[PDB]
């Protein structure tokens, strides 16, 4: 435990990420889904999001049809911290998907005002898992 912070008061980036996510208007998502060629940041964020939601997708067009829904952000804010999915996918994401320097608060933000809160959201879940893993049985100090 590097920090004395946990899911309790964990960096507000979690709640702040969900608040912004829902604060995204359909127009903000419409332009993103209309973007024929997304800049390094929009696509990457979309891919990571799908993995967290337990969904598999790696096609700009495939994802576009997802964000098109006006409730694409609602499901992102209703995400249940607890689930039977495979949360161990976080490491799989790190590999190179997260290595890319385009996966930052700067590049992502500049990618889309609606995508800015996304990068934070995906980065928020990863932060939570930190405490969840610590409290999780097995491998305890």
Swiss-Prot record:
**UniProt-annotated location(s):** Cytoplasm, Cytoskeleton
- Cite any additional comment in the entry: Present with 195 molecules/cell in log phase SD medium.
Function (record text):
Cytoplasmic dynein acts as a motor for the intracellular retrograde motility of vesicles and organelles along microtubules. Dynein has ATPase activity; the force-producing power stroke is thought to occur on release of ADP. Required to maintain uniform nuclear distribution in hyphae. May play an important role in the proper orientation of the mitotic spindle into the budding daughter cell yeast. Probably required for normal progression of the cell cycle.
Q: What is known of its domains?
A: Dynein heavy chains probably consist of an N-terminal stem (which binds cargo and interacts with other dynein components), and the head or motor domain. The motor contains six tandemly-linked AAA domains in the head, which form a ring. A stalk-like structure (formed by two of the coiled coil domains) protrudes between AAA 4 and AAA 5 and terminates in a microtubule-binding site. A seventh domain may also contribute to this ring; it is not clear whether the N-terminus or the C-terminus forms this extra domain.
Subunit-level organization: The dynein complex consists of at least two heavy chains and a number of intermediate and light chains. Interacts with DYN3.
Family statement: Belongs to the dynein heavy chain family.
**What name goes with this protein?**
Dynein heavy chain, cytoplasmic
Specify the species: Saccharomyces cerevisiae (strain ATCC 204508 / S288c) (Baker's yeast)
Source lineage: Eukaryota, Fungi, Dikarya, Ascomycota, Saccharomycotina
Q: Which gene encodes it?
A: DYN1
């Amino acid at each position: 435990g590097s920090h004395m912070k946990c899911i309790q008061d964990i960096e507000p980036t979690i709640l702040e990420a969900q608040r912004g996510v829902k604060n995204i208007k359909k127009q903000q998502l419409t332009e993103i889904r209309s973007m024929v060629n997304p800049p390094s940041g929009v696509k990457i964020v979309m891919e990571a999001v799908c993995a967290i939601l337990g969904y598999q997708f790696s096609n700009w067009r495939d994802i576009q049809q997802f964000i098109r829904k006006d409730d694409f952000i609602h499901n992102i804010v209703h995400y249940d911290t607890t689930l039977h999915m495979k949360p161990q996918i976080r490491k799989y994401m790190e590999e190179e998907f997260l290595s890319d320097p385009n996966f930052t608060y700067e590049t992502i933000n500049r990618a889309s005002k609606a995508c800015g809160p996304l990068y934070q959201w995906v980065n928020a879940q990863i932060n939570f898992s930190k405490c969840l893993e610590n409290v999780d049985p097995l491998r305890q100090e």
